[PDB]
C-alpha cells in the first residue's frame, strides 16, 4: 500500500476541507474585489536571489530551497512580495500609477506545517497613508465579513519612523536599522544581547527599549515632537480610519514593528482580543524595496499578508465555521435504464437553465437514488418515469411529497 | 537590477494576463458546479514513489524532482491522478461512492513550457461508461462556454479493450499492454521499431497496427464481434452523448490510446478540426491504479485532464479571447482633502451596498481623478464636494452629464 499521508508538514484538502478553505477565499475575493483590487499571480518557483536580504530575517532563515539539475539557485517562495516587486519592476515606466493588486499564493518554508495560503493586498504608487488606511480597512472588512467584530479582533498600529529616529540620533549607521527591527520583532529580554551583539552601546539599547513601551501617540509627540512624519503619519490614519467607520477595529500600540527587514513606515497586524493565538495578518509600507531591486526611482508600496491558518482556528474557536454540506439544484433519476436517454435530455434542459445538476450514474432502484439525492445534499429530485414521460412529464419530488411537472415548467 | 523575468518555462500573471486565466478558470468552475462535482485540492509536492510506474511513459520520464534535506525523494506533481487515487485510497471506506472530485492544479515537468494548469474532472465508483459520457459531455460544456461549436472542436473516443484483446490473442502477458499502449500513443517506421525491442514479432505488430486503422465501430465488430466489451460500451456511450445533446461534439477513433499507462477501458481526447493544435483535453477510464496502490476493494474510475494552454491558443484563433479590461463599480473622489473624511463615509456606504469603489487615494485634481476613473473602467463616478455635502448630497456622473444625488439614494 502506498503512504496515504502527504508530505510533511503539507495539507491535502478533500471536499470537506475544500469547502472550508472555498468559504475563507471567496471573502478573500470578495473584499478584493469590493475594494476595487486587481487579480495577479506568478510561480511558487522563484531565483534563491529575489530573497538574500541579509538582515537576518526569519523568513529568508526558513526557506524552502534547492538546486535544480542545471545548478541554478532556485526557492519556493516563502512570501509573495519579492515576485510582486519582480513584476512591477518588469513593467518598469509602462505600469499605470496607483495601482492595487492582490494574490491567494501558496508559500512554503522549512525547518510543524511546510506551507500555507496567504491573501497579499499591496497599493503601489500611493505616498500617503491613505494606501495603509485602505489596506488596514481590508483586513478588517474580511474579519467581518467571515462573522468577526470589533469586540473579536483588533489591528494593532505603529510606524518604524519613530525608533529610526532614535537610532538615527545615536549615531547608528542606517544599514543596521532593519537588523535592529527584526531584532526588536523578537521581543516575545535575550533581545538586548543581539542589539549588542549588532553593535550598539547600553544607551541605545535603553531609548529603543523606551520608546517601544510609549502607550499613546501623545507620549510620541512629547519624545520625538509632534511634527514628526510618524506622528502626523498616524494622526492622519487613524482620522481617517475612524471615518470609515473601523475606529473600534484599531489602535495604537508602540511595540509592533514585524520581522520584516523592507518596512519603512507604517506598521499594522491583526490579532485576537483573547490573545489566544498569533498574528492574523502582518503588513506596512516598504518605500525602498523597489530602490534595493534596481528602480531607477523609488516606489511607494504598502500591502498585507494575511494566512489561511490562524484565522481559521480563531474561527473554529468562534462558532463561526460550520460545515458547510455539499449542494446541487437537483438529482435526475432514470426509472430503470430504458429511461437513461430520456434522462439525459431533462438532465440537458436543466443544466442550459443554469441549474446544478446530477444524474445518476450507476444502475439502481430509485429510493436508493433518493437516498444518495439526499446525500449530496439535493434541493430537488426529478424521477424521469415511464408512465409521465409519454404525458411529457416528469415526477418532482422538494427535498428540504411528489408531484408530475411538465418538462418546460422545469425550470 | 535583479532578474525580472520569472524562472525558465515559468509564467507570470499581471493582471492583463490574470484576467485572462480567470476567465477560464470561472468556466472551469461553473462547469464543475453545473454537472455536480466537489472541489479538492493537494500538496504541489508529493513523494516520488507515487509517479514510479515503469511503463516509459513521457509524463514520469519528464519530472520535477529533487531531493530533500533530510534526504526524501519528492516531486513537483507531474499529474493530478495519483494526488486523488492517494486521497481516495486515505478516505477507504468512509467516502461515499459514487463521488465526481474536480480540481484546478498547476502540473510541472523538467525537459519549453515548465508549468501548467490543468483542470481535472474524475468520477469515482460508477462502473458504467454513464461516467465517460459525463465526462466528455462536461469538456464539451466547457468549450462551448467559452464561445466554441463543434464545428470548431470535438472529442475523439476509443476503447483500450479493443487493443487489449488484440494483445492477449498473441499470447503478450498481460504486464506488457500498458508499454504497448504507452508506445502506440507515439503515432509508422519508428513505432514498430519500440513494439520489437519490447518483445513482440511483427504479425502482432501488424494485428496492432491493423486495428488502429480501423475506422468505424461496425469495423471493430467485424474483428472482435459485435458483443465484445468495447463494441457494447462504445454503441451505448454515443447513444447516451446523443440523447444529451452533444453528438455532433463525438466520434470515434481507432488510433486514440492516451499515453499514461493506467487506462484500462474508453479513452478520449478534446481536438480542434483544423488540425493546428495539439490535444485540448485527454482521458479515460482507470478501473486497476487503485488496485495497484493497495486497494483492498476493485475501485471503478474515469476522468480527464484539460490543460490552459492549448485551449488558449484555440481562442485566440478563433477570436474569443477579447481584453476583458478591469472594471470597478464607483469611483469616489474627494473635492478637495478637506473632503476625505466625508468621502470615506460615502465609500463605506458603497462598499456595505455590494458595489466594487475605489476612492482616489493620493492628492490630485478633479479632471485627473476623473480619467483616473475612466481607466480603471469605472462605471461611475462619486464627486464629493463642500457644497453639495452641505444638502447631504454628492455629484454623480455615469462614465457608460453631472447630477446631485442624496446620500441615501446612492445604492
Ligand atoms: N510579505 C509580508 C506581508 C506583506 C505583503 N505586502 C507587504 N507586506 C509577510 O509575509 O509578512
Ligand atoms: N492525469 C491525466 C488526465 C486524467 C485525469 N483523470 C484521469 N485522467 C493526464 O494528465 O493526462
Ligand atoms: O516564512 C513565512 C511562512 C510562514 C508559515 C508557513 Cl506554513 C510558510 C511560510
Ligand atoms: O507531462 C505533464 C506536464 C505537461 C505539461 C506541463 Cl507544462 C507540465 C506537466
Known sequence: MVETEPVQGCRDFPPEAMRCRRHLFDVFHATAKTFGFEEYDAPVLESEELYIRKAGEEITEQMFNFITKGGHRV??????????????????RSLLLPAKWYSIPQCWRYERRREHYQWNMDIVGVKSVSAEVELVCAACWAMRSLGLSSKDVG????????????????????????????????????????????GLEPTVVDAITTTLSLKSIDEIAQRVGEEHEAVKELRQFFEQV??????????????????????????????????????????????????????????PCAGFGFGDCV???????????????????????????????????VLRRLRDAGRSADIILDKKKVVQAFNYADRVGAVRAVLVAPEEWERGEVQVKMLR???????????
Not at 75 to 92: F, I, Q, V, Y
Not at 248 to 257: I, K, N, P, Q, R
Not at 313 to 334: A, C, G, M, T, Y
Open 75 to 92: 526557492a519556493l517562495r516563502p512570501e509573495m512580495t519579492p515576485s510582486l516587486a519582480r513584476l512591477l519592476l518588469g513593467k518598469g
Open 155 to 198: 489591528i494593532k498600529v505603529n510606524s518604524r519612523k519613530v525608533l529610526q529616529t532614535v537610532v538615527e540620533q545615536a549615531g547608528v549607521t542606517s544599514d543596521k536599522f532593519a537588523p535592529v527591527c527584526v531584532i526588536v520583532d523578537k521581543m516575545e529580554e535575550e533581545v538586548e544581547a543581539q542589539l549588542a551583539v549588532l
Open 242 to 299: 475612524e471615518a470609515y467607520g473601523y475606529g473600534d477595529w484599531v489602535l495604537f500600540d508602540a511595540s509592533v514593528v514585524r520581522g520584516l527587514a523592507y518596512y519603512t513606515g507604517i506598521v499594522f497586524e491583526g490579532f485576537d482580543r483573547e490573545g489566544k493565538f498569533r498574528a492574523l495578518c502582518g503588513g506596512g509600507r516598504y518605500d525602498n524595496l523597489l530602490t534595493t531591486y534596481g528602480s531607477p526611482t523609488p516606489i
Open 311 to 345: 484565522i481559521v482556528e480563531l474561527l473554529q474557536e468562534k462558532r463561526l465555521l460550520p460545515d458547510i454540506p455539499h449542494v446541487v439544484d437537483d438529482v435526475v433519476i432514470p426509472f430503470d435504464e430504458s429511461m437513461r436517454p430520456h434522462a439525459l435530455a
Open 401 to 411: 411529497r411528489g408531484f408530475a411537472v411538465p418538462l418546460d415548467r422545469l425550470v
